[PDB]
Design an enzyme around this catalytic site. Structure first.
Site, PDB file in Angstrom:
ATOM      1  N   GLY C 133       0.792  -1.209   0.000  1.00 45.01           N
ATOM      2  CA  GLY C 133       0.000   0.000   0.000  1.00 45.01           C
ATOM      3  C   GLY C 133       0.831   1.269   0.000  1.00 45.01           C
ATOM      4  O   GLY C 133       2.016   1.277  -0.330  1.00 45.01           O
ATOM      5  N   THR C 169      -2.914  -7.801  -4.515  1.00 50.15           N
ATOM      6  CA  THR C 169      -4.172  -7.077  -4.451  1.00 50.15           C
ATOM      7  C   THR C 169      -4.031  -5.622  -4.867  1.00 50.15           C
ATOM      8  O   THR C 169      -4.991  -5.051  -5.384  1.00 50.15           O
ATOM      9  CB  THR C 169      -4.757  -7.151  -3.042  1.00 50.15           C
ATOM     10  OG1 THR C 169      -3.884  -6.481  -2.128  1.00 50.15           O
ATOM     11  CG2 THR C 169      -4.905  -8.600  -2.607  1.00 50.15           C
ATOM     12  N   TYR C 214      -6.972 -13.964   8.026  1.00 46.89           N
ATOM     13  CA  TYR C 214      -5.692 -13.296   8.250  1.00 46.89           C
ATOM     14  C   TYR C 214      -5.197 -13.440   9.677  1.00 46.89           C
ATOM     15  O   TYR C 214      -4.011 -13.209   9.934  1.00 46.89           O
ATOM     16  CB  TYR C 214      -5.779 -11.810   7.902  1.00 46.89           C
ATOM     17  CG  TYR C 214      -5.944 -11.507   6.433  1.00 46.89           C
ATOM     18  CD1 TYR C 214      -5.704 -12.477   5.474  1.00 46.89           C
ATOM     19  CD2 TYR C 214      -6.346 -10.247   6.005  1.00 46.89           C
ATOM     20  CE1 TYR C 214      -5.849 -12.204   4.133  1.00 46.89           C
ATOM     21  CE2 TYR C 214      -6.493  -9.962   4.660  1.00 46.89           C
ATOM     22  CZ  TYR C 214      -6.242 -10.946   3.728  1.00 46.89           C
ATOM     23  OH  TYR C 214      -6.391 -10.676   2.387  1.00 46.89           O
ATOM     24  N   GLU C 244      24.184  -9.783  16.685  1.00 43.46           N
ATOM     25  CA  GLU C 244      24.966 -10.945  16.274  1.00 43.46           C
ATOM     26  C   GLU C 244      24.532 -11.453  14.906  1.00 43.46           C
ATOM     27  O   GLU C 244      25.337 -11.500  13.970  1.00 43.46           O
ATOM     28  CB  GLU C 244      24.862 -12.056  17.322  1.00 43.46           C
ATOM     29  CG  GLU C 244      25.667 -11.791  18.582  1.00 43.46           C
ATOM     30  CD  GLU C 244      25.662 -12.970  19.531  1.00 43.46           C
ATOM     31  OE1 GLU C 244      25.118 -14.029  19.158  1.00 43.46           O
ATOM     32  OE2 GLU C 244      26.200 -12.838  20.650  1.00 43.46           O
TER      33      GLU C 244
HETATM   34  N1  LIG Z   1       0.587 -10.936   5.376  1.00 47.95           N
HETATM   35  C1  LIG Z   1      -0.450 -10.108   5.310  1.00 47.95           C
HETATM   36  N2  LIG Z   1      -0.494  -9.128   4.344  1.00 47.95           N
HETATM   37  C2  LIG Z   1      -1.548  -8.287   4.268  1.00 47.95           C
HETATM   38  C3  LIG Z   1      -2.591  -8.398   5.165  1.00 47.95           C
HETATM   39  N3  LIG Z   1      -3.497  -7.446   4.869  1.00 47.95           N
HETATM   40  C4  LIG Z   1      -3.049  -6.733   3.812  1.00 47.95           C
HETATM   41  N4  LIG Z   1      -1.846  -7.251   3.420  1.00 47.95           N
HETATM   42  C5  LIG Z   1      -1.009  -6.753   2.316  1.00 47.95           C
HETATM   43  O1  LIG Z   1      -0.992  -5.339   2.353  1.00 47.95           O
HETATM   44  C6  LIG Z   1      -0.958  -4.812   1.046  1.00 47.95           C
HETATM   45  C7  LIG Z   1      -1.659  -3.463   0.973  1.00 47.95           C
HETATM   46  O2  LIG Z   1      -1.050  -2.506   1.811  1.00 47.95           O
HETATM   47  P1  LIG Z   1      -1.809  -2.068   3.153  1.00 47.95           P
HETATM   48  O3  LIG Z   1      -1.990  -3.279   4.024  1.00 47.95           O
HETATM   49  O4  LIG Z   1      -3.157  -1.498   2.796  1.00 47.95           O
HETATM   50  O5  LIG Z   1      -0.865  -1.013   3.929  1.00 47.95           O
HETATM   51  P2  LIG Z   1      -0.709   0.565   3.611  1.00 47.95           P
HETATM   52  O6  LIG Z   1       0.624   0.897   3.000  1.00 47.95           O
HETATM   53  O7  LIG Z   1      -0.821   1.322   4.905  1.00 47.95           O
HETATM   54  O8  LIG Z   1      -1.955   1.024   2.713  1.00 47.95           O
HETATM   55  P3  LIG Z   1      -3.258   1.617   3.444  1.00 47.95           P
HETATM   56  O9  LIG Z   1      -3.600   0.758   4.630  1.00 47.95           O
HETATM   57  O10 LIG Z   1      -4.417   1.648   2.480  1.00 47.95           O
HETATM   58  O11 LIG Z   1      -2.959   3.017   3.910  1.00 47.95           O
HETATM   59  C8  LIG Z   1      -1.642  -5.850   0.176  1.00 47.95           C
HETATM   60  O12 LIG Z   1      -0.959  -5.990  -1.048  1.00 47.95           O
HETATM   61  C9  LIG Z   1      -1.575  -7.143   0.963  1.00 47.95           C
HETATM   62  O13 LIG Z   1      -0.718  -8.060   0.327  1.00 47.95           O
HETATM   63  C10 LIG Z   1      -2.556  -9.381   6.139  1.00 47.95           C
HETATM   64  O14 LIG Z   1      -3.476  -9.492   6.939  1.00 47.95           O
HETATM   65  N5  LIG Z   1      -1.482 -10.237   6.209  1.00 47.95           N
END
Ligand SMILES: Nc1nc2c(ncn2[C@@H]2O[C@H](COP(=O)(O)OP(=O)(O)OP(=O)(O)O)[C@@H](O)[C@H]2O)c(=O)[nH]1
Ligand SMILES: Nc1nc2c(ncn2[C@@H]2O[C@H](COP(=O)(O)OP(=O)(O)O)[C@@H](O)[C@H]2O)c(=O)[nH]1
Ligand SMILES: Nc1nc2c(ncn2[C@@H]2O[C@H](COP(=O)(O)OP(=O)(O)O)[C@@H](O)[C@H]2O)c(=O)[nH]1
Ligand SMILES: [Mg+2]
Lengths: 160, 427, 427, 426
Positions: C133, C169, C214, C244
């Site tokens: 994001g 996504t 999740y 380390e």
């Molecule tokens: N491993 C994991 N990845 C996640 C999860 N939820 C979202 N993601 C990843 O987070 C990506 C999107 O970025 P965001 O989670 O929205 O983080 P951000 O940079 O703050 O963007 P915003 O929240 O919209 O401000 C997606 O491509 C997902 O792959 C989760 O619950 N677990």
């Protein structure tokens, strides 16, 4: 026992609704306390809660939540009479019935009560606000429900 | 916390906006008076998005309705949900646009909008974090098109950096119900492409087609036609207001759906087309859903996927559904749609999951996309607009009011600019 | 004397931190209220006896801090350790770095000063973020930069959400992914990565759960995270330090991107029905099935490896079991370092949680490695980023945001350098 | 010390396999839950041949099962003693074959066996030193004959010098249960003679004959039939597990009764039999075994041995008995039966004595045999296989899946060398 149990399940649904509206109930309690301008003593009486809702209620949603809580308390008091006539019981059953009467009593306090392990009212409410101001009003319903479940289990284990 | 203002123009969205504000009031458990009888406090945290509070524990609409014919205002005021809007939200004029773009713009529109623009500062300045504005309007009706595009002009200049979302109904191939549709639409899309951030296209003919082939409703009255159109845009806005396991704000959809600035016309859809008699005949399963988001029948325009080209797709899922099954099946369908999605943007799609469903339904999905075949929707207008100007039709209703003939020739070039860009970047 | 500051930015990373800090309260046996020196590393003793974690959850959107504010663990946290901005970056690095990111960076460092002053001697920081994001990518960049300038040489560890190759996504992820890896090249010291797809994939063929959420992703991620910092928290037979494996897993300060693996990853009835021995917890680590990063360990070469053990284990087998590993032929290390390991032993086994889906096991291990297998995985990732610039797509969003046209060409040279630097290693 | 692996192929293999581990779990005192409760301490001493140690005194079989029908594998899952089997030790395929040899070997063989070898190597490296393999395959079934050969082929290519002791069911005169059984049987022998250490030709018809004429059961369903077959297997593999007065481990058993690299078919026999008429009228002694040792009523293969000679005969006698009583009973008949045996190998029987009897029984006797009466069984198998090519019938399914006709003819090149080699010494 099924006739009282239907009202018990309805009270369970109502208590679920009150637990969902716990934040609105806490906001209504805070607004009523601010309107009454007496925050030195904690809320301890169902009669005090009714007097708070009658005059020191601010919003329509807050009044609806206070009316729902008072109706839940009144339904519990009305179902206590029907649960009393189910079985004669033992001395422990009579002691638990007296405890149920004291918990449904408006004059009896509520601050010393605490939420049970399955309930998350303590995990939801604020630290100081539930520790010193309004923990008992939130926690009174789940302890009463646990006592009713324990009384039902005791009557089920007790031969007729 | 996050607030966005809705302006209303034309009798079209006056019929959506009663149904559209029914659903959001239904989702938040609001009586037709406007007070609260709900179950949870979760909606109350972000109930401030499209309302304001009132003294005495009341919630007032953020929706302003403007028309030059006062008939639909009072009917909305006297409708099933008519006692909820605050009584300065309504602004009504004297001389209607008469399905003429010119009439509702210069000689009659200007007197109304100055009082309307004063209502805009009254609603915008109340919000703390005002993200932008939405506007529901029509391309077929005169007031929704001509006076609406004037609002598009005035609001953007004074508030430059916000988000502008327009849910606009578009003319259809065979449900053409106004004679001046290529005159009304072209004089709006000359300014729609120029000055709008988000544009949603609604086709009347597909809505009649949706309620027939899969719903099988016996009497599809306009309450049923407004029902799905409200439900689609209800699902668009629930990721901004209601928390989900993976969230996306309105600008989040705005940034990724728009690769090039002049291409921001969106084509939506709604997933559970379940019938009234075969609910128990359907396994309520996401492996049923993906072939329903990408079937030959579930679209909301006259744009076939085999006649189209899918640049970007947003699939907002609503309800309690598992993560992995959805994420793999979204990976599934992009693979088998080898020639249907585009190739020069790998990983085209966004999945969006909101936890809370709509009421009365377990899981719910909205398929939203941008396709090149909206130019094929546009080329039906484009083949109709150019030949009709050659025979000199209907000029007196427009050129008798005062605009020169030259910018009408600009519009058929500017509308040709739009379809040139889709065709150029198709390959 | 040993302590840390945890940071969470981004609705991926902050949503991990809920279940991440779920474990620490359960492992140290401290109630969600915060009331009852292994616990001094993370929590802070209030004078009444209340333990407040030294963790800060900052996101520009109020949709997830309110979830923490409405979570089970409300009573755990200080009122000001959760700082919420006005508007999320929404898949835009520069907007989250120039225009929006400058608003509350002063607020975060103000909380950083307060958590710094409580530590008279400090080991390291733990940021948690995502590459997908805007906010977890854009803000975390200059948050990392200004902590680099402010603080000289303390340990800087990064847990980042790696973009999966097939599923993604986000749509403008490749512009976000490259621009963050530019900033982390020069002032980031340790960058642990988890990618979505392998986490989705491996919990299918091992946990055999049809419908996870999740929350299952977080607890799978959590025991990877906790095993890294369990060395600070508790005493054991052979303990390591943050600095380390920083010296170990980063043989070259230009290359600081290791991967993660965890074992045993099996279900409850299987652990009942399969015998838990020291031999079987280490052979699965060098199986390719359990590799939770979408890259081929057969393609890559293990440059520097870290092994931390948990539960009941004897060092006689540890020296014995590694002898099996070095004599294998499918696992191929580098030629220039036959002593490429760093093995640690901790007595404390991982603990199951209420509501969990994993098993309770006798012994456990986290497999860490630096390899060149991601370079071939970045060859596809560079191919995605190359394709976004041939047609000059998506630039015009960022042009008015504040960045420059030539900054993509420099970043193209940077990922050419980063791919060539791995290509210089493998010779 | 020595560890062993049990391969399995075919739907018919499941019922043989499930009864096998049902029989041998009882003789060590194991419940289907997995909690040992017994008094004998010698079983736990040598339990490491078959099982694998688990937590809390539990042990899990080293049984590998391969099939193309989940429905019988679901029954094996729902079986009573199948709840001790390991989950990934099951290898079950979703696509069937259709009782044809090609589908299991070429088309569906390209994917399922990759899941087999991972299970094998997972079990292989956890052992001390692997003694060998067992596979229960078939000649009349399409899937069992199909993947069983490819199970044999790749493990032999992976494992150079070990043992491979198999149990295969052969065609019969009157229990013909497949039309393409002569197609399936003959070309399966092509992969057997070149590449298999031991195979035991158990014939169904004698199993029916012994339950009718000899055990006299009113309704002997297949669970009775597999009760003989499992105990024949355990008689071969009780010397490796249990000490006795004359021990003979499988490798020297494989040395002794395999004189030549190819002519290594075996013809079992195991007769501690007692009819429901005759619980008490028998006089259970070593001499009564010897008359019962070579009576035709006791052997597993529907052939009359008076049309030939026995090549090698092994008489493992398990129970409490004296070696002077053991050998002398066979010593007399080696002298007496100068005609029924081969003359080029004097002292035609080498024995082995085991001390521990099977559970629920007092004293029992086995038999392992290669004989010069298996020509006419091999002769009659070949003669239709030649005759099925004259009309060329039924071959277009094998032909239509991309295969050659010569592979049907190359087996007739190889099977005729098998039967002519039996003709050479006879
Ligand atoms: N491993 C994991 N990845 C996640 C999860 N939820 C979202 N993601 C990843 O987070 C990506 C999107 O970025 P965001 O989670 O929205 O983080 P951000 O940079 O703050 O963007 P915003 O929240 O919209 O401000 C997606 O491509 C997902 O792959 C989760 O619950 N677990
Ligand atoms: N599908 C649909 N179309 C509508 C609705 N209301 C109006 N329209 C379309 O809008 C056109 C008339 O626009 P109108 O509502 O009168 O807008 P106005 O003249 O600007 O006030 C017609 O051609 C209709 O097809 C509605 O409720 N549903
Ligand atoms: N010993 C034994 N043989 C069996 C049993 N069931 C079937 N058979 C034999 O197996 C043959 C059929 O094998 P089949 O099931 O087609 O093998 P598959 O196709 O590989 O599963 C028949 O000729 C039977 O004589 C059993 O329970 N025990
Ligand atoms: Mg995020």
């Amino acid at each position: 026992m099924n006739e009282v149990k239907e009202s018990l399940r309805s009270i369970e649904q109502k208590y679920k609704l009150f637990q969902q509206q716990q934040l609105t109930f806490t906001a209504a309690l805070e607004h009523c306390r601010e309107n009454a301008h007496d925050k030195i003593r904690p809320i301890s009486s169902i009669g005090q809660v009714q007097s708070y809702m009658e005059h020191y209620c601010n919003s329509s949603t807050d009044r609806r939540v206070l009316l729902m809580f008072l109706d839940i308390c009144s339904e519990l008091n009305k179902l206590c009479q029907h649960f009393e006539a189910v079985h004669s019981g033992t001395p422990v059953t009579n002691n638990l019935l007296e405890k149920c009467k004291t918990l449904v009593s408006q004059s009896n306090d509520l601050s010393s009560l605490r939420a049970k392990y399955p309930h998350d009212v303590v995990n939801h409410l604020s630290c100081d606000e539930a520790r010193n101001h309004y923990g008992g009003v939130v926690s009174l319903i789940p302890l009463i429900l646990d006592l009713m479940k324990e009384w039902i289990a005791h009557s089920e284990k007790l031969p007729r | 916390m996050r607030e966005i203002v809705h302006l209303q123009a034309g009798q079209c969205g006056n019929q959506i906006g009663a149904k559209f504000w029914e659903v959001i009031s239904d989702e938040h458990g609001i009586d037709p008076t406007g007070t609260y009888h709900g179950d949870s406090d979760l909606q109350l945290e972000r109930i401030n998005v499209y309302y304001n509070e009132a003294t005495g524990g009341k919630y007032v609409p953020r929706a302003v309705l403007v028309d030059l014919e006062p008939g639909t205002m009072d009917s909305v005021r006297s409708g099933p949900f008519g006692q909820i809007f605050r009584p300065d939200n309504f602004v009504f004029g004297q001389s209607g646009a008469g399905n003429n773009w010119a009439k509702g713009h210069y000689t009659e529109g200007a007197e109304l909008v100055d009082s309307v623009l004063d209502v805009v500062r009254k609603e915008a300045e109340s919000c703390d974090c005002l993200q932008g504005f939405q506007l529901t309007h029509s391309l077929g009706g005169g007031t929704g098109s001509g006076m609406g595009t004037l609002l598009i002009s005035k609001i953007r200049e004074e508030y430059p950096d916000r988000i502008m979302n327009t849910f606009s109904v578009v003319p259809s191939p065979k449900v053409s119900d106004t004679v001046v549709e290529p005159y009304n639409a072209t004089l709006s899309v000359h300014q729609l492409v120029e000055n709008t951030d988000e544009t949603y296209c609604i086709d009347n003919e597909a809505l009649y087609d949706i309620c027939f082939r899969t719903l099988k409703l016996t009497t599809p009255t306009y309450g049923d036609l407004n029902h799905l159109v409200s439900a689609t845009m209800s699902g668009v806005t629930t990721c901004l207001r209601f928390p989900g396991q993976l969230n996306a704000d309105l600008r989040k959809l705005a940034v990724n759906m728009v690769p090039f600035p002049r291409l921001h016309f969106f084509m939506p859809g709604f997933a559970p087309l379940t019938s009234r008699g075969s609910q128990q005949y359907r396994a309520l399963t996401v492996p049923e859903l993906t072939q329903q988001m990408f079937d030959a029948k579930n679209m909301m325009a006259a744009c076939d996927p085999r006649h189209g080209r899918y640049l970007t797709v947003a699939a907002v899922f609503r309800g309690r559904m598992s993560m992995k099954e959805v994420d793999e099946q979204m990976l599934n369908v992009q693979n088998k749609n080898s020639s249907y999605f585009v190739e020069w943007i790998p990983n085209n799609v966004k999945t969006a999951v909101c936890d809370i469903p709509p009421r009365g339904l377990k899981m719910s999905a909205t398929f939203i996309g941008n396709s090149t075949a909206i130019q094929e929707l546009f080329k039906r207008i484009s083949e109709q607009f150019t030949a009709m100007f050659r025979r000199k039709a209907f000029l007196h209703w427009y050129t008798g009011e005062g605009m020169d003939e030259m910018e009408f020739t600009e519009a058929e070039s500017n509308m040709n600019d739009l379809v040139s860009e889709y065709q150029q970047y198709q390959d | 004397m040993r302590e840390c500051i945890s940071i969470h930015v981004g609705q991926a990373g902050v949503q991990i931190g809920n279940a991440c800090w779920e474990l620490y309260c359960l492992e140290h046996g401290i109630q969600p209220d915060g009331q009852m020196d292994s616990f001094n590393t993370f929590f802070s003793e209030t004078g009444a006896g209340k333990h407040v974690p030294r963790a800060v959850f900052v996101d520009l959107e109020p949709t997830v801090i309110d979830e923490v504010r409405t979570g089970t663990y409300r009573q755990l946290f200080h009122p000001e350790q959760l700082i919420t901005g006005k508007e999320d970056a929404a898949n835009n690095y520069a907007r989250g770095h120039y225009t929006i990111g400058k608003e509350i960076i002063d607020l975060v460092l103000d909380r950083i000063r307060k958590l710094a002053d409580q530590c008279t001697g400090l080991q390291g920081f733990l940021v948690f973020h995502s590459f997908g994001g805007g906010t977890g990518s854009g803000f975390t960049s200059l948050l990392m930069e200004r902590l680099s300038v402010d603080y000289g040489k303390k340990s800087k560890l990064e847990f980042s959400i790696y973009p999966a190759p097939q599923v993604s996504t986000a749509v403008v992820e490749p512009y976000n992914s490259i621009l963050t890896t530019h900033t982390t090249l020069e002032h980031s010291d340790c960058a642990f990565m988890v990618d979505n797809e392998a986490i989705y994939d491996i919990c299918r063929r091992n946990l055999d759960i049809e419908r996870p959420t999740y929350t299952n992703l977080n607890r799978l991620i959590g025991q990877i995270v906790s095993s890294i910092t369990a060395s600070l928290r508790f005493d054991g037979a052979l303990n390591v330090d943050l600095t380390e494996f920083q010296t170990n897993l980063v043989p070259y300060p230009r290359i600081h991107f290791p991967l993660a693996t965890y074992a045993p990853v099996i279900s409850a009835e299987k652990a009942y029905h399969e015998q838990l021995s020291v031999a079987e917890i280490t052979n699965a680590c060098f199986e390719p099935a359990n590799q939770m990063v979408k890259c081929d360990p057969r393609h890559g070469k293990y440059m520097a490896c870290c092994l931390l053990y948990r539960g009941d284990v004897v060092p006689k087998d540890v020296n014995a079991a590694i002898a099996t590993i070095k004599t294998k032929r499918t696992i191929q290390f580098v030629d220039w370092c036959p002593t490429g390991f760093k093995v640690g032993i901790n007595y404390q086994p991982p603990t199951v949680v209420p509501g969990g889906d994993l098993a309770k096991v006798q012994r456990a291990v986290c497999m860490l490695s630096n390899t060149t297998a991601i370079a071939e995985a970045w060859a596809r990732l560079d191919h995605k980023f190359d394709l976004m610039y041939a047609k000059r797509a998506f630039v015009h969003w960022y042009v008015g945001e504040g960045m420059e046209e030539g900054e993509f060409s420099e970043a193209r040279e940077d990922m050419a350098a980063l791919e060539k630097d791995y290509e210089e290693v493998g010779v």
